[PDB]
Amino acid sequence: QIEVGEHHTATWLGMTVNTDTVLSTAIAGLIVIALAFYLRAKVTSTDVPGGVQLFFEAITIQMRNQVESAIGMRIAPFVLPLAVTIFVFILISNWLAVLPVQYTELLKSAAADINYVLALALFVFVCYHTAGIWRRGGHVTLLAPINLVEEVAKPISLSLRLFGNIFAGGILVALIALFPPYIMWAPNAIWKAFDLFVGAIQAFIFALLTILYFSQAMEL
Amino acid sequence: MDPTIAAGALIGGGLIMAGGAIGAGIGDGVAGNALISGVARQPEAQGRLFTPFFITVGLVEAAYFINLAFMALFVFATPVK
Amino acid sequence: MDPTIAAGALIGGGLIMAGGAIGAGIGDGVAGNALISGVARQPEAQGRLFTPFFITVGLVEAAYFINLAFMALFVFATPVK
Amino acid sequence: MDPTIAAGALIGGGLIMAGGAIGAGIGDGVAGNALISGVARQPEAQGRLFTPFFITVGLVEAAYFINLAFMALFVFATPVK
Amino acid sequence: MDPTIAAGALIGGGLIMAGGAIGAGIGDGVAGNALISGVARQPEAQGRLFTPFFITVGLVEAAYFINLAFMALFVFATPVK
Amino acid sequence: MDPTIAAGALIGGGLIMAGGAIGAGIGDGVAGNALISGVARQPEAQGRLFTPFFITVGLVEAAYFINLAFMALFVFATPVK
Amino acid sequence: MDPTIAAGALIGGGLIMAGGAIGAGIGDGVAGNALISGVARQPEAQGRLFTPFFITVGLVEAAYFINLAFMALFVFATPVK
Amino acid sequence: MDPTIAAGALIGGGLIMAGGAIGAGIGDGVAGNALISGVARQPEAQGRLFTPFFITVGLVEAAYFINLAFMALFVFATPVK
Amino acid sequence: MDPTIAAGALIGGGLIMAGGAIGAGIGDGVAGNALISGVARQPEAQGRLFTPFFITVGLVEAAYFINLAFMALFVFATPVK
Amino acid sequence: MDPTIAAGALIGGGLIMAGGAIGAGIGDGVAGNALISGVARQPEAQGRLFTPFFITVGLVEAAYFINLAFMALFVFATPVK
Ligand SMILES: COc1cc([C@](O)(CCN(C)C)[C@@H](c2cc3cc(Br)ccc3nc2OC)c2cccc(OC)c2F)cc(OC)n1
Ligand SMILES: COc1cc([C@](O)(CCN(C)C)[C@@H](c2cc3cc(Br)ccc3nc2OC)c2cccc(OC)c2F)cc(OC)n1
Numbered sequence A: 001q002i003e004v005g006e007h008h009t010a011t012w013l014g015m016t017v018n019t020d021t022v023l024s025t026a027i028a029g030l031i032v033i034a035l036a037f038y039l040r041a042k043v044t045s046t047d048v049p050g051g052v053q054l055f056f057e058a059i060t061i062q063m064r065n066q067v068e069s070a071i072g073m074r075i076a077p078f079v080l081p082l083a084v085t086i087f088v089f090i091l092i093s094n095w096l097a098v099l100p101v102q103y104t105e106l107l108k109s110a111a112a113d114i115n116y117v118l119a120l121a122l123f124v125f126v127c128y129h130t131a132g133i134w135r136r137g138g139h140v141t142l143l144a145p146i147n148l149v150e151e152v153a154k155p156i157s158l159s160l161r162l163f164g165n166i167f168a169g170g171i172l173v174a175l176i177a178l179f180p181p182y183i184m185w186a187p188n189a190i191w192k193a194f195d196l197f198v199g200a201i202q203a204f205i206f207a208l209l210t211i212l213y214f215s216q217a218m219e220l
Numbered sequence B, C, D, E, F, G, H, I, J: 001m002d003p004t005i006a007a008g009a010l011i012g013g014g015l016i017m018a019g020g021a022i023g024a025g026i027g028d029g030v031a032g033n034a035l036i037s038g039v040a041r042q043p044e045a046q047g048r049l050f051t052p053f054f055i056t057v058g059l060v061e062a063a064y065f066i067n068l069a070f071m072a073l074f075v076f077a078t079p080v081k
């Protein structure tokens, strides 16, 4: 029968660590850096770009438009590279879940575990806090408590929306398994189709909220 | 005995998925109602209207799929016994 | 005592499809509202107005079908039993 | 005993038809609102405004009929038993 | 005790008429809000707005009437007894 | 013995009048909003707008009054004993 | 015997006041949005706008007051016993 | 026994405060939307608009405060005991 | 026996915070809609629009905080005991 | 015994999360409906519209996550036990 997301684990420094999540996030990272080397070797300028270059440049200028609309690029240029990895590292991190492995499968996405999204969201938090302190050291003072929550609810909602939006898939891939295999394919098909849309939209909103939260941090 | 907690887990998990579907479904309506109308006002604005649409959906659907996560914590992994 | 979790599964599954049909019925209503308005405005935009329509409806139906799948999990495969 | 399941179907089956009607009754209202205004703005549009209108009402009425069926399945089949 | 079924019919039948009244009540308002506006904008069109109005009210009142039928099946028949 | 039926009658009647006042209050509000907006735009229109207004308030108030009659039927005159 | 009927009276009275306050609090909020909007667009209209307004609120408040009376009847008079 | 009446009264007070909260919140939101819109469109209007705004808020808020009062009368001074 | 009063207080807190969040969230949404529309229509208004906005959000939030206070007054310092 | 409080925390917490998802998923939509429309009319305004947007969403999301905190407190840390 169905069970919640348990893990295989190993102890590396007194603390136990999940064997997958760390495996599938490494599989995502190596493919990302493999595309980075392959593009950097293939890179064009006077000649016509190939598929990987016209893809990654479309993402970099989409991020450039967003960051330069939000803040002057003279002030905060580093939020662009930080934003495109947050898009593409997360994008691949969801896409690999489309290929069939199950029989219980280890190959759940990196965001189907809360630790991954907590590390990313907490990193984004300390980064934008360092951005705020770097510029010097809301829109109404009397809202301090909400502006108090904002600093918790930004990383907590970032992590929780990324977790929930992907953890549901990690459950539904098991749910349709309970139906007869000779009829289970069609709902499995539809859901696999929708998986890409939610994975992409989720990577998109996390990157955009990262930019827009950074914009709000480094104000004045 | 356990069966009263397990009945409470099914009723209480059911509420989390009921309020989820109402909030998301209506949200992606009131947001989509502003997209379609936009693409009816300037039939060539669609391209950019996806940038604020998928932002609003990403905020709305979050309130549903965070509910769905916690519903699995209610239904399969009941924090109380 | 199986009947107590049985009744809990039925009330939970009932709530899941109550919230599902409200989210679906009102989301498609508010989306088709904008569809009819935009087709009354620019009758030639109909062919285009379906692509922002069948997205929202599409999205909305996700939050109905997922409730219909979880209703089947509560009712035909009750998790704790 | 078994009665505790019986009412569990009558209550849960009621909930399925409660959220069903709030889904249809509001949906057909908010879709119907956009047809009456359209026709109120140009009477010659009543010919073409039925093409989007009955689509939406189609989707909407599905979300009802499915709950209707499921109510019968609750009241005349009592699955969890 | 068998009287729990009766209580399940009264509570459950109560939901089938609670959801129906929210279906008709608002569904007819959101629909009439258009007719009162169409007759404000264009008085001589009052003759033709009654077709879109009685289609949309006809669909919305069907959700109430059907519900009222099943509520009578719940309370005067009690299928599961 | 009577008490579970008596509690079920009171809770069932409570649901019927809860849903009744929601259907009534919001439908009258949304109909009255178009009435006030028509009288805002056109002072000469008031006599024509009252027709559409009282048609829609009729269709609304019927649904509240029928709920009030069924709550009275549940609470004073329980059909199941 | 009697205390469980006392419960049904308190919960049923609570439902009646919950639905009354939702129907009324939103009703006035919607009918009032037309008054505020009309007086923004036309300061000169404030004299006429109070007649259609106070009709609508009246009808709305009737749904609150009738529910307030039936809650008092449930909790103080307790009909079934 | 009295504790069952205690739970009934507590759930009754919860329902009364819950429906009160929904009413007051959404009514203030909708009436406030028209106030913010009137002050956007007509920069001088804020003086006149506070009469329609505090009339409509005055009604809405009443439907809250009344539920608050009645809630205390339910929990501190349980009418049935 | 306290456990019944405990469950009553827990479901009462559940209702109070469910209603307060529906009210506050939708009130803040509907007030925020007018604020963004005002800033997108008259950008020169952006200084003044915070005034009406934080009046209306002030009223909408008050409805939350009170509830949040009283839910703690049910859950940690239960009135009935 | 304790299992009645346990179930009381799951149903109480389930309500908190249902109301949080309805309030927030709709708010984030009703606010977003502004944003999209703004960008559909004056794309040049996109950069400024995110300022009043994330103020309103900043309020709305807080009403979700405060509800998530109180549901978590109810279910993991049942205060009265
Ligand atoms: C007592 O049960 C009914 C049901 C129904 C309907 O469900 C409509 C309900 N609404 C009006 C609230 C209806 C229906 C189902 C649909 C299903 C999909 Br999927 C798509 C479009 C649909 N459109 C529909 O009609 C608009 C329907 C169903 C079955 C047989 C039917 O033939 C008699 C039939 F008409 C009507 C009815 O009238 C007495 N009684
Ligand atoms: C008896 O249960 C149904 C269900 C359904 C649907 O769920 C839609 C319900 N709405 C119309 C009220 C439907 C569906 C699922 C989706 C899922 C994702 Br993820 C994205 C888009 C989706 N779009 C969909 O259609 C718009 C669907 C589902 C399964 C098989 C299907 O093939 C028969 C099928 F059509 C229709 C139906 O008709 C009687 N009965």
Ligand SMILES: COc1cc([C@](O)(CCN(C)C)[C@@H](c2cc3cc(Br)ccc3nc2OC)c2cccc(OC)c2F)cc(OC)n1
Binding pocket: E024, E058, E059, E061, E062, E064, E065, E068, F059, F062, F063, F066
């Ligand atoms: C029993 O208590 C009622 C009920 C009803 C109705 O069910 C509607 C309730 N609404 C007004 C709130 C009504 C009805 C059913 C419909 C069915 C479809 Br399918 C389509 C349109 C329909 N339209 C309808 O009315 C516009 C109806 C029903 C039966 C016999 C009837 O004739 C004696 C009759 F009128 C009216 C009423 O009047 C005081 N009392």
Ligand SMILES: COc1cc([C@](O)(CCN(C)C)[C@@H](c2cc3cc(Br)ccc3nc2OC)c2cccc(OC)c2F)cc(OC)n1
Binding pocket: F024, F057, F058, F061, F062, F064, F065, G059, G062, G063, G066
């Ligand atoms: C019994 O408690 C009431 C009820 C009622 C009403 O139900 C209205 C309730 N709403 C305003 C909250 C009312 C009514 C019934 C309708 C029936 C249909 Br079929 C169509 C339109 C209807 N419109 C109505 O009002 C315009 C009504 C009822 C009975 C006798 C009546 O005459 C003595 C009478 F007026 C009023 C009341 O006092 C204010 N107390």
Ligand SMILES: COc1cc([C@](O)(CCN(C)C)[C@@H](c2cc3cc(Br)ccc3nc2OC)c2cccc(OC)c2F)cc(OC)n1
Binding pocket: G058, G059, G061, G062, G064, G065, H059, H062, H063, H064, H066
């Ligand atoms: C005791 O608790 C209240 C109640 C009330 C009211 O119920 C209004 C409730 N809403 C504003 C929250 C009030 C009322 C009843 C109505 C009845 C119909 Br039939 C039509 C219009 C009505 N309009 C009303 O107010 C505009 C009312 C109550 C009793 C006697 C009355 O004198 C006849 C009376 F007017 C007011 C209040 O203090 C402000 N405290």
Ligand SMILES: COc1cc([C@](O)(CCN(C)C)[C@@H](c2cc3cc(Br)ccc3nc2OC)c2cccc(OC)c2F)cc(OC)n1
Binding pocket: A143, A144, A145, A146, A149, I058, I061, I062, I064, I065, I066, I068, J059, J062, J063, J066
């Ligand atoms: C855990 O309890 C909270 C509460 C709150 C607020 O209620 C905001 C709630 N929504 C925005 C999510 C906040 C608040 C209370 C109000 C009271 C009135 Br009467 C009028 C306007 C009010 N506006 C407010 O902010 C919009 C608040 C509350 C208490 C003390 C406070 O100290 C001053 C305080 F600021 C925030 C929070 O973050 C964890 N936790």
Ligand SMILES: COc1cc([C@](O)(CCN(C)C)[C@@H](c2cc3cc(Br)ccc3nc2OC)c2cccc(OC)c2F)cc(OC)n1
Binding pocket: H024, H058, H061, H062, H064, H065, H066, I059, I062, I063, I066
């Ligand atoms: C104790 O919990 C509260 C309550 C309240 C209010 O109930 C407002 C509730 N809303 C904001 C959700 C408030 C109130 C009652 C009303 C009564 C009628 Br009949 C008509 C208009 C009314 N309007 C009101 O506010 C404009 C109120 C209450 C008591 C004394 C008061 O002082 C005279 C008082 F102002 C405010 C509050 O602030 C900490 N705490």
